[PDB]
Nucleic acid binder design. Sequence first.
RNA 1: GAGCGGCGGUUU
RNA 2: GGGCCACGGAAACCGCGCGCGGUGAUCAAUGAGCCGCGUUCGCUCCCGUGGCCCACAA
Lengths: 317, 53, 120
Amino acid sequence: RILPADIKREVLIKDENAETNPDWGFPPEKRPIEMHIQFGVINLDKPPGPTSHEVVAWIKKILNLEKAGHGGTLDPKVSGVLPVALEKATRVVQALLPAGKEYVALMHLHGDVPEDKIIQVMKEFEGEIIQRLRTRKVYYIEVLEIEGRDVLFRVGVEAGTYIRSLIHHIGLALGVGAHMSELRRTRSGPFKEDETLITLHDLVDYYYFWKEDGIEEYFRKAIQPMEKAVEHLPKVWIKDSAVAAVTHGADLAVPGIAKLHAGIKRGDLVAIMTLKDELVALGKAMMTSQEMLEKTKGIAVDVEKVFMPRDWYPKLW
Amino acid sequence: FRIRKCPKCGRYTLKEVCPVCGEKTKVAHPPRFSPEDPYGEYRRRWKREVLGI
Amino acid sequence: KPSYVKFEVPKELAEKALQAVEIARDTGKIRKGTNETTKAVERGQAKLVIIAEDVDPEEIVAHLPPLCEEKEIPYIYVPSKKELGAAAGIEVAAASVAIIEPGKARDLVEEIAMKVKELM
RNA sequence: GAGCGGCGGUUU
RNA sequence: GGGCCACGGAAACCGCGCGCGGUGAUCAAUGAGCCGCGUUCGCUCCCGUGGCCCACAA
Ligand SMILES: [Zn+2]
């Protein structure tokens, strides 16, 4: 039940006296509904039937959006967590694609096998597996219930792992063979099965409750701030005085850091946040946490994708 | 569809009563949705009432 | 019980609903399944709508009560979709049924409509 | 134009 | 020169699947079979055009 994204990170304070000016920027709960959508992400509960692409096409038409993109494609018959990043948040899916996933799956064996052997043999699949040629991690497998040839289980896996193929290989290890009869994604990175997970019916109904009834509350809760899509990443938080620079394509230099997560290695994907926990940009660390911590000059993060508009913070340089 | 889940437990099960919670379980997949949504008007009517809108 | 169940129907009355459907089927005209039930209410052909109380997800039939009141057509609940199916003359469940022509159940259907009127 | 995370095909 | 941002780097038909409409079935009415109509998102590199900045955080 533990994936790498579930690691607790420690915050390291670089500048004790950094403060943020409440007049600058728009932290998620100061975003007017329209702005909230522009930088929004939907934790969608995909229904079985349509493809993932089709589902996003429907969302764009119904919600009158110009742009949107989903994370890990779910197959037509599969239900569950499908992050849908909207408008200006669209490019944040690139932070989700590589994140771990969890599924509940129903396997149907093609011959009779004792419950104990089924369980014992499935447990062997935790750890590395090779599937049709590439290697992929299985972080955990938990058998929930067995009814004859029907095996209900949960599995946490590395991005790109095919549960179908896993199930097929389990069938071969047992000899009788097996196929996947039902699949549901219950987690993708920071997106999980909680109150934010919303069906298409609720999504569109809440939308109309907003546009047509004048009730903003339900639709506002249907949309997550883009910051949510970055919850699993290591962060460096920056001072107000560096924020407009970064939004203008400046790399983040050490003197601009207020605090940062421990454990950052060179080359890591990091999220650059303001002290109000707004997403500014995605980048790649050019230093370790300890380097960023002890040094007083040099480029700490190579800024690659900028999400915050250039006019949220003044050009203090 | 056979996968069910406890609305209380969060437990996934094939049973109609949660082996943990004891609560009645519900089908785990969301209802199928149409871009045409022929009865949307009426579902909204029922849903506003449920939510006290 | 489910939110689309807008009122309490006594065991007696529910049993009558199944009877009406059963009688209307071989002596009159009914439609079975929610798509045909809905079309019947929309085309103004349904004299009575019968809705199962164990439908999951609720969205399968939750539009019916508002749609019926719109078209001013009486609707009533029975406890079991499986049992409503059997009465409708099929071996599978039926989440909802519409009686189009009552037949030998004219009186039964007239009675039911009166008690629900009270429950509303 | 080169690739990753449902598209399989015939055409300039 | 460099970074960041936007737009462009094909189009039209067919098939599965799925959706809708119609019909409504000898255990798929939470929709079979058949007919007709619809229907597939983005991201990353690199390159072209255009825009904003060159900001070690004061
Ligand atoms: Zn419980």
